[PDB]
Symmetry: D2
């Protein structure tokens, strides 16, 4: 029964490598539940969090991680949505007010009163996590913790981004960047009746793309994505930008078909110059997309449950976390790194 104490990679300074330190096990107060983390995925956003890469930096000291999945250990008072033992996941969208303009219209994702797991509230880089039962993800029974962990963020984000491009079955989607989110985006696009064109700067990643269903591949370092896509398919109906690069964005605009949509999911910093003439005359749409809604999450989880999407995960230990992060900043990760516990 509850260790009363757990280990967790905590962040005390922006840029200062985390430190595994046995800390207290939270207690499920009213409207809360405790989750024993079985697996926990490592998202690129975890780096941006402990690296104070964004305007609203994470209050220190925090525990990152929003791809934490496990069993409901304890149940706070009033909790109806989940019971003890339930296999659940705690995503980026920790909570939302539930009654504002966006929450009432199905866009809780844009709620200004939201909390974010592993950023403004402690996450899954620990053995236990406190979660809001109403925003937690109900996992499919037929998939192991290590496998669905990625869906908790890379999965929903990519799935929702694809919905945001509005590309219909039989059409093309150009996926810029086949990394953590990218290799899983190829699978969702596939399952959504879309022809996939994969763009990256590493042949290994491009190879994985073909294994996953991509019928067109382009190494942006060996050839121009823009004219390759425009020449071979006439422009993609939808474009999903995963790349964190600077040039990737401009090439995404250029790879788009007339009247097509470029869905932005990557979070690079700063303003990006965009061709006025091209966007207006070609009637291009640029859509910003953040993770997913609870409905999006459940839908994204269903695809995994149907076996239509399998994340390419590589195991990792909680203490080797710093090595793992440095590996992602260097882009030396092939797929998604899910922490075992």
């Amino acid at each position: 029964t509850l260790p009363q104490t757990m280990k967790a990679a905590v962040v005390h300074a922006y840029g200062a490598p985390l430190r595994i330190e046995e800390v207290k096990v939270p207690l499920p107060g009213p409207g809360q539940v405790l989750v024993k983390i079985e697996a926990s995925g490592v998202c690129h956003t975890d780096l941006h969090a402990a690296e104070g890469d964004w305007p609203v930096k994470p209050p220190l000291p925090f525990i990152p991680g929003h791809e934490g999945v496990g069993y409901v250990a304890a149940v706070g008072s009033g909790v109806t949505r989940v019971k003890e033992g339930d296999r659940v996941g705690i995503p980026w969208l920790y909570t939302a007010c539930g009654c504002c303009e966006h929450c009432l219209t199905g866009w809780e994702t844009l709620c200004e009163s939201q909390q974010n797991t592993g950023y403004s509230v402690n996450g899954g880089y620990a053995e236990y996590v406190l979660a809001d039962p109403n925003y937690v993800g109900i996992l499919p029974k037929n998939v192991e913790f290590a496998e669905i962990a990625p869906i908790l963020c890379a999965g929903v984000t990519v799935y929702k981004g694809l919905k945001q491009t509005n590309a219909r079955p039989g059409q093309w989607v150009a996926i810029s960047g086949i990394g953590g989110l990218g290799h899983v985006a190829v699978q969702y696009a596939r399952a959504m009746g879309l022809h996939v064109a994969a763009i990256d700067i590493d042949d290994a990643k491009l190879e994985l793309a073909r294994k996953l269903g991509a019928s067109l591949t382009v190494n942006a370092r060996q050839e121009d994505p823009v004219e390759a896509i425009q020449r071979d398919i006439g422009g993609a109906h939808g474009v999903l930008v995963t790349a964190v690069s600077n040039s990737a964005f401009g090439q995404a605009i250029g790879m788009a078909r007339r009247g097509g949509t470029i869905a932005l999911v990557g979070l690079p910093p700063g303003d990006f110059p965009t061709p006025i003439f091209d966007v207006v005359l070609k009637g291009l749409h640029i859509a910003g997309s953040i993770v997913g809604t609870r409905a999006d999450l459940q839908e994204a989880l269903d695809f995994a449950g149907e076996g239509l999407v399998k994340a390419t995960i590589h195991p990792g230990k909680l203490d080797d976390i710093n090595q793992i992060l440095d590996q992602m900043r260097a882009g030396q990760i092939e797929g998604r790194i899910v922490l075992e516990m």
Copy 2:
């Protein structure tokens, strides 16, 4: 009995003054008609064309003008849509192929085989204009030439742009740039049940907006437009950028509410900045819109026929086109200047 010769304003060199000269009156070939210009609107696009601001420039020399309105004076063989004496207008979209992806799906506007009146084909800065009967606008009988001229471009464009915004009745739309396009957008926006926030850089232009239905008025030369819209209404559900300013485009994006849509219609040369991080986290949509479809055009014209939209025009003479364009360069025009032949 058709002059055989006519006066027209010609652009022979970029940046150079136009020259009023005598040119041969064209004869309607098989699928064409000759329109006798009665009124002709001056659009800022004519400035960009005469100045050679865009990536794709208008071959020289040429006669500008895509807000030309008048009577069908002669009909070529095989023409069926209109007949001699019909009151008709020749807009930016001169023709389209009629059988490509875009043309078949209600987006002839994105057709790659289109021609543009007063740019790639001669336009209305003349006494007569050749035209494709199939793309000409059919004018409402109760509105006078000079008054409906602006709807051939400023009206359709702005109307389709407001539709691309997806703002529904009761919602707010921030319109940046209250000129030829903008002053008419205020009217279409009101007729569409929207609350209007107008942004410009001249108090006289904001007063025109107020007179036309704008509830909130902001002068960007006196205060920060972004914090003004964000402070006074919390951001607009829809934003329509008409302004010939790259920075105005960046500010426009900052005027949107979470989940809002920014329709880009202005064509200043160069690039505009996309704050990816903000666009993503706020779930913003940016949409480039080009003039309007034939269906869009007739719908736009109907609003004018209903008296719901009335362009603010000022008469002009073909011989004074250089000083008129100078007046536009200096932003000294209230609404639109419409040439009368």
Copy 3:
């Protein structure tokens, strides 16, 4: 402080006239609030409730009324959305689970776990009402209780139904039945940029329609609505069916323009024969619409607050309720009857 006892028109038998009987004043338990009813509208659905007109009949004995508006008298424990004294309204949608397929996607209105005010839970035909703070309507400060009461049901229902027809500004909407919901539907349609065609079987009601903005009127008892609408406007883009009649439905289908949408809001019983050939070949859409979502309710309330919609209300006393109901079953009501208290 709380009367501890209140009067209320209760229903003890389906068909057996209600009876005003001083009963206990409910106490706001956790997650609840008490509302002192200042005004309470009488909806046609109240008859269907005490007349066991529907499959799932109201548990007896109940207090009908879902257009009850007043002040928040008491606040249960945990309540955050509303404070004591707040002017609020309790609509048809009493509560919903908040985490099901429909609730997560913005359609709480279709929640199978919902409760309905004045049907499955006591309503506003009393001096006080227990409500769920999260589904109650936040009223606009500038409108008196007697006036916004109708919006709590007739308003939102009609507003949402109009949205469901998808008729865009500048287009036509045929409103079949200008009664409780109908006369307020003419105002919303008006405020939504729609041209209104009013259909009824009473000239008095049709007269009110013209006063409210209808530009086309038809007494279905004096002339055929179908050919009148088809001849005068070519078919309405949208049709909103308020009538409880049998023939009204078939005429609504016939009054629709090709590709148009007939939005059903009226709740007559039984199956209605529909022309297969006409619906298929004319690409007609039939949309069932129930009251509104919390977002729809707030949006509908905003129109009243802007003064764009004014319900035509007639005062009534709680004890004269039976007379009032018999008056509605006979169709002798001109507008909406709001109970004073």
Copy 4:
């Protein structure tokens, strides 16, 4: 060198057997082409036409067939879209005006000035057919005549119907009637990422559906289809009714999930029942869909070109058309019977 005479199956009286007779081979007038029929699909619409089941009947005598496929044999003057030797098909939508509300908005399908192949104009139950080059389907080069014939109607229709359903990848669609249209709808539905529940009245037809991708199979002659779909999947997000049965239409509506859409494509004569109360409370949408647009047709054909859809066909001879239609009357056809000239 063009026979000058050809064999064709003619309908001279409703209900009476067709007569194979010699008729003059038409000559392409100005905007026409002559197509030499190589394969011709038998559609149930041909039965309704020969039987005179519809409100608007086909003038007698006439040659049915709107799934006629072949080579352009002769071109009239002014024809530009196709040229001699092109593999092309003549569908139900023979021509349209090209400039009305519907034609200009991507809905030429609803054009009031259209003509229908094998109904108001002679069709493919012959060796040659006159056609309007602008509405003919352009066949993929890698698919054989007999195999693509059904896409000219069964395929496009069913494909556009599934789109009208609005069911997105991962969702369920219940397809009622697995015949010519239905067996091909199962394939388009799968290619669109949908889970398929097939309903028919013959086990052999359900087995065909299973082989083509259906997950749930229901025989309406053995069990209540409605409670079966409602029990096994809780209702389908989308429903597509192909069945030549009025009651099947009522049952189809009962197969939808709350908020679901039922696309009506079948054309049995008479009316279908709309349970208004259920449609309203469940927020259901009923949509009538007619064949498909030229854009729809090319998209439908592309799926076939991609090998994602393959019609199950059986060869037939023009001389055996009466026995073939008898076979259809008795529901003894597996998929489609395609005549080979």
